[PDB]
Amino acid sequence: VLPENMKRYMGRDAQRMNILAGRIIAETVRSTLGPKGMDKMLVDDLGDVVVTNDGVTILREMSVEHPAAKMLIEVAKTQEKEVGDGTTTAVVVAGELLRKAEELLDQNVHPTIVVKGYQAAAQKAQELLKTIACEVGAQDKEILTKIAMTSITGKGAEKAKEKLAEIIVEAVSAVVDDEGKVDKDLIKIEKKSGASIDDTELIKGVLVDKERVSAQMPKKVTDAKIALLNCAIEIKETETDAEIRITDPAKLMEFIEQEEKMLKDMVAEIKASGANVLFCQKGIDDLAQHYLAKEGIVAARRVKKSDMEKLAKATGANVITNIKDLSAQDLGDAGLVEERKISGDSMIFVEECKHPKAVTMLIRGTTEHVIEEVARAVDDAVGVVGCTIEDGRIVSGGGSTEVELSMKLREYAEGISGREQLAVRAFADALEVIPRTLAENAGLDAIEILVKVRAAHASNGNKCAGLNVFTGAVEDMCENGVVEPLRVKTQAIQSAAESTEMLLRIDDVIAAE
Amino acid sequence: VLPENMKRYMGRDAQRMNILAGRIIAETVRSTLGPKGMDKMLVDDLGDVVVTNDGVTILREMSVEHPAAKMLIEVAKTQEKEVGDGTTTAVVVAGELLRKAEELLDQNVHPTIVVKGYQAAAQKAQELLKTIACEVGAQDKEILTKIAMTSITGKGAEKAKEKLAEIIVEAVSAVVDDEGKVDKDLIKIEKKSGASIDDTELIKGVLVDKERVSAQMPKKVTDAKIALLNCAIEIKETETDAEIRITDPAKLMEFIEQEEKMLKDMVAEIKASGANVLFCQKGIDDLAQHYLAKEGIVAARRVKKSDMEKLAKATGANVITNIKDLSAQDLGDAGLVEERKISGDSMIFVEECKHPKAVTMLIRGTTEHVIEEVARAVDDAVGVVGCTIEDGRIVSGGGSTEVELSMKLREYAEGISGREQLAVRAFADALEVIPRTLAENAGLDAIEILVKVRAAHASNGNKCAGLNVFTGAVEDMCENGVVEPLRVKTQAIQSAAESTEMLLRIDDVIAAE
């Protein structure tokens, strides 16, 4: 029936082969999983080198032969399209989940039961997460400082964790407005090597990496009135083609003086507004700079269009098209506009804004690489503070959730009884991989840590436990402000289970040669 | 350095390959392990068929290619030479033990620790077995009947388990003499299809499958005096070559009458002893049968030399070489010697012996195959009764030992602490394979049974639990007389651990191509 050369596996042979292939891949990528996960270096037959942690990338680049291994590759791609993250997690968890599930099959527990038990326990797991979650004041000063400081600790920047935690909480709180949605676009990160980390600071305003275009401009302006124009301050010309037809010598002068008046009127109007700072999107003719300078007006030219819009938002200036439309109500306020040297380079500071909706955090450090990591550290601190502001729920980490779930699910298992309890029992036992690889990747005794932690948790409670990989001992997770959003864990479970259910649904595998 | 063609694996690659090969073999044979283990049919390239359960045989016959698989074959052979049994057990247990041990290696627990923890827990396991063992009266009538009856139940012969349990306990108790060593050689098993199992019985004597050689012999003898001779009752001749040299006609008669007297004197002497039964090892001339018959003496000829010795032991007759040495003190006693037809065939019954040291259990049944299985059933009942008579210790089965050990070892683990506790913890977790495969091979829910049993055991106690595969529910193991010798379990652990220690000691594998 089939072309000679085609190969086929069926029943328990199809199952054995498929599972085994998937498992081996899982063992290959699992070494990247987690905060303490490491990376791989893949050098193709051409010499190109890729160093990554991404499961898809590793699997996409490698050259697989086995059909069963090629079919699993599709799983990794669908995981990326659907959810984005959890590629490595889903493969590793899916493998163990399938392995433990097959142990039930060998016991003669119908796969419809195993899959149902997992579904049921998985849905109940989300409820338990919502139940054990510790509710907090979204804008609580003290707890916020713990989130911030907890992130900063264990990094080069820890030397000034107190000041940094302060500025970070304040920056988010300012731009968030209501309680709350945050747009991290209103918090700029400028990093310039020089000084130390102690010099880092928050600026309730903006730090632009530009200079005052002309030398003759004032070096200091107080109570500045900033103007934001996007139209070029040049001699406008009609869209329709035009040309002057001179017929008398009197006109040679007539037109020259006409263009001079137009140019002077332009500049004169800007001054008439009371503006002492002007940001133009297009060009500024040299002569215009000269008059601007003589009027003690500070000007900037050739500003990016996207920057013109960021400048409007930050400074609170209204972009006007026609000068005719400009009014005092369109002017923005800055408490201070000053030229400062930072690591020698000249930069402009717009600081002491009344109630800025965009702030900048100028980072200092003894090295480029240092300020880069400090920037990453803050990107996270803003992130986690944002998570708590939108979802006033927090939860202990160090695999505390999975332990709570394992306990309660075991009791629930007993309530249900029958074969279905075995399926719910296996789900609870499967959850232990998290604790297992947390301490394994950390280089802690996985067996001993789990025994000590679980015991300590059962005694001291929920907010007096977890694993502290840094000190290698139980602690107070709450006191140490070591918390993550519930959404992290909830979404992880959801996407993870939906992938496992797809695999569990397959009862027939037909792979061509 | 090495000849091109040679292949080498080292470090974690040598370890991965070796473990994996061993594991796959273990999965192949594990389906035979246990009371509910099944058999395999192996048909070589020649057509020969072997159906066995033996691990060595299966592995010896199969044609392996992989060097690592060939090296494991040596394990199976050494297991046979050293201990005999536990070939399949040792391979299967050794595989899982190695797998669980490698999980510790990945956690960075020095293999010297893992091996030590197993050794320590294994030695402690033997102590715990001696501690939990329930001591009983070696010759307790009632408990003995439970051992007997428990064996018989669930077999074709169960219809008469009460009578059979009675005869079996009595047979062993009689031949054991002191308390106690038993020689199963004193309990003969004769099986002849015909009648039913209800007709089975014990005979305090012997049942020989022979006939009375001559028709004219008495058909019934009371208070019989049995003689056991090994010398032939013929005309003796000198070792040195001799010949009669007749020189007178008077001698032709002289010698004839001389040989007649010698022959008559022989026979006359036997009668003179008061013997009415005679067992001769060699031949009996027809004329001798005639006189023996006329004297109402029963005789048997051409008896096996080994049978002559069994006849001496059983009947309590003393084998004499020269008739001159025979005396009344050499005579044996039998309460009855009678010819009976059993399934038509004629057999001799030596029954109603005073205090027989050898008994026979005549088995009846509607089929040959039935009486054969009944014989096996008794061979076991005698065995287990023998185990209890020599070691007045018994213990609950159904994996009760391993559960007790798992509990106590876990506490001991906590006492020791450190990494060593993880090794002792893994040993305790490894013990669960027994419960796992007991219910798996039985077709019971392995997970659910274990949960129910352990809980029930923790509540009802030690003698109110175990698994009862027959009813598929907890029971009272003691009330049901479902016990095994401690020696079974103790030796199993000892031999098993010594094989595992050999594997654990290997840190270098060098296999040629």
Are B108 and A443 a contacting pair at CB < 8 A?
yes
Cα–Cα distance measured from residue A375 to residue A40, given in angstroms and rounded to the nearest whole number: 25
Cα–Cα distance measured from residue B285 to residue B302, given in angstroms and rounded to the nearest whole number: 11
CA atoms in the 13 A half-sphere facing the CB of B188: 20
Nearest residue to B226 via CA among B269, B296, B275, B294: B275
Rounded to the nearest angstrom, the minimum Cα separation between B104 and chain A is: 9
Q: B443 in helix, strand or coil?
A: coil
Cα–Cα distance measured from residue A56 to residue A81, given in angstroms and rounded to the nearest whole number: 11
The CA-CA-CA angle for residues B140, B143, B147, to 5°, reads 125
Residue A197 makes CB contacts below 8 A (sequence gap 6+) with A156, A157, A159, A160, A364, A365, A366, A370, A374
Residue A249 makes CB contacts below 8 A (sequence gap 6+) with none
Q: A220 in helix, strand or coil?
A: strand
Cα–Cα distance measured from residue B344 to residue B195, given in angstroms and rounded to the nearest whole number: 11
- Cβ distance B148 to B158 under 8 Å? no
Find the residue in B nearest to A438 (Cα). B107
Reading the block at residue A481, the tokens are: 């402000």
Find the residue in B nearest to A109 (Cα). B445
SS3 content of chain B, % helix, strand, coil (to 5): 55, 15, 35
Strand-pair partners of A337: A221, A350
Q: B390 in helix, strand or coil?
A: helix
Cα–Cα distance measured from residue B362 to residue B189, given in angstroms and rounded to the nearest whole number: 7
Are B445 and A107 a contacting pair at CB < 8 A?
yes
Q: How far is CA B101 from CA A334, B96, B488, in A?
A: 69, 8, 26
Q: What are phi and psi of A334, to 5 degrees?
A: -135, 130
Nearest residue to B110 via CA among B486, B427, B476, B418: B418
Reading the block at residue B373, the tokens are: 């299985």
- Cβ distance A457 to A400 under 8 Å? yes
Are A445 and B109 a contacting pair at CB < 8 A?
yes
Nearest CB partner across the interface for A445, out of B107, B443, B445? B107
Q: Which chain A residues have a beta carbon less than 8 Å from that of B108?
A: 443
Cα–Cα distance measured from residue B64 to residue B169, given in angstroms and rounded to the nearest whole number: 48
Rounded to the nearest angstrom, the minimum Cα separation between B350 and chain A is: 55
Are B422 and A445 a contacting pair at CB < 8 A?
yes
Strand-pair partners of A300: A279
Residue with tokens 């601190």: A381
Distance of CA A248 to the CA centre of its chain: 69
Experimental method of this PDB entry: cryo-EM
- Cβ distance B357 to B172 under 8 Å? no
Burial class (CB in 10 A: 0-12, 13-18, 19+), A459: exposed
- Cβ distance B335 to B206 under 8 Å? no
Nearest residue to B329 via CA among B227, B230, B233: B227
Rounded to the nearest angstrom, the minimum Cα separation between A422 and chain B is: 6
Cα-trace Rg, chain B: 32
- Resolution of this model in Å is 11.0
Find the residue in A nearest to B438 (Cα). A107
Nearest residue to B466 via CA among B407, B400, B402: B400
* Cα distance from N-terminal residue to C-terminal residue, chain A: 15
Q: Which residues of B touch A (CB under 8 A)?
A: 104, 106-109, 418-419, 421-422, 425-426, 440, 443, 445-448, 451
**Would you name the residues of A annotated as active-site residues?**
54, 87-88, 380
Nearest residue to A278 via CA among A340, A331, A355: A331
Cα–Cα distance measured from residue A261 to residue A256, given in angstroms and rounded to the nearest whole number: 9
Q: How far is CA A75 from CA A82, A83, B206, B315, in A?
A: 11, 12, 76, 82
Nearest residue to B337 via CA among B196, B483, B227, B448: B227
Cα–Cα distance measured from residue B407 to residue B425, given in angstroms and rounded to the nearest whole number: 10
Nearest CB partner across the interface for B448, out of A419, A445, A451? A419
Residue A182 makes CB contacts below 8 A (sequence gap 6+) with A172, A175, A176, A382, A385, A386, A389, A390
Q: How far is CA B83 from CA A306, B60, B380, B386, in A?
A: 85, 18, 20, 21
Q: A162 in helix, strand or coil?
A: helix
- Cβ distance B110 to B368 under 8 Å? no
Cα–Cα distance measured from residue B172 to residue B387, given in angstroms and rounded to the nearest whole number: 11
Please, what is the angle between helix A486-505 and helix A67-82, to 10°?
Answer: 140
**Would you name the residues of B annotated as active-site residues?**
54, 87-88, 380
Residue B96 makes CB contacts below 8 A (sequence gap 6+) with B26, B430, B433
Pairing of strands A345-351, A205-208: antiparallel
Q: A52 in helix, strand or coil?
A: strand
Residue A172 makes CB contacts below 8 A (sequence gap 6+) with A182, A187, A382, A385, A386, A389
Distance of CA B351 to the CA centre of its chain: 26
Cα dihedral sign, B173-B178-B181-B187:
negative
Using left for φ > 0, alpha for ψ between -120 and 50, and beta otherwise, residue B155 falls in beta
Cα–Cα distance measured from residue A174 to residue A159, given in angstroms and rounded to the nearest whole number: 25
Cα–Cα distance measured from residue A69 to residue B228, given in angstroms and rounded to the nearest whole number: 81
- Cβ distance B88 to B398 under 8 Å? no
Q: How many CB atoms are closer than 10 A to CB B148? A: 28
Q: A229 in helix, strand or coil?
A: strand
Cα–Cα distance measured from residue B26 to residue B32, given in angstroms and rounded to the nearest whole number: 10
Nearest CB partner across the interface for A419, out of B418, B425, B445? B445
Rounded to the nearest angstrom, the minimum Cα separation between A75 and chain B is: 27
Residue with tokens 């003669």: A108
How many residues would you count in chain A? 513
Residue A338 makes CB contacts below 8 A (sequence gap 6+) with A220, A348, A349, A351
Listing DSSP states for B197-214 in one string gives GGG-EEESEEEES---S-
The 8-class DSSP code of residue B329 comes to G
Listing DSSP states for A284-346 in one string gives --HHHHHHHHHTT-EEE-S--HHHHHHHHHHHTPPPBSSGGG--GGG-EE-SEEEEEEETTEE
Find the residue in B nearest to A420 (Cα). B448
Peptide bond before residue A386 is cis, with ω within 30 degrees of 0: no
Q: How far is CA B441 from CA A16, B281, B397, B446, B477, in A?
A: 20, 52, 16, 9, 20
Q: Which chain B residues have a beta carbon less than 8 Å from that of A418?
A: 448
Cα–Cα distance measured from residue B73 to residue B64, given in angstroms and rounded to the nearest whole number: 9
Burial class (CB in 10 A: 0-12, 13-18, 19+), B56: middle
- Cβ distance A357 to A228 under 8 Å? no
Q: What is the largest CA-CA distance in chain A?
A: 110
Q: Which chain B residues have a beta carbon less than 8 Å from that of A409?
A: none
Nearest CB partner across the interface for A108, out of B109, B425, B443? B443
Q: Which chain B residues have a beta carbon less than 8 Å from that of A23?
A: none
- Cβ distance A237 to A199 under 8 Å? no
Reading the block at residue A151, the tokens are: 């992130």
Q: What are phi and psi of B405, to 5 degrees?
A: -60, -45
Cα–Cα distance measured from residue B449 to residue B308, given in angstroms and rounded to the nearest whole number: 56
How many residues would you count in chain B? 513
Are B447 and A107 a contacting pair at CB < 8 A?
yes
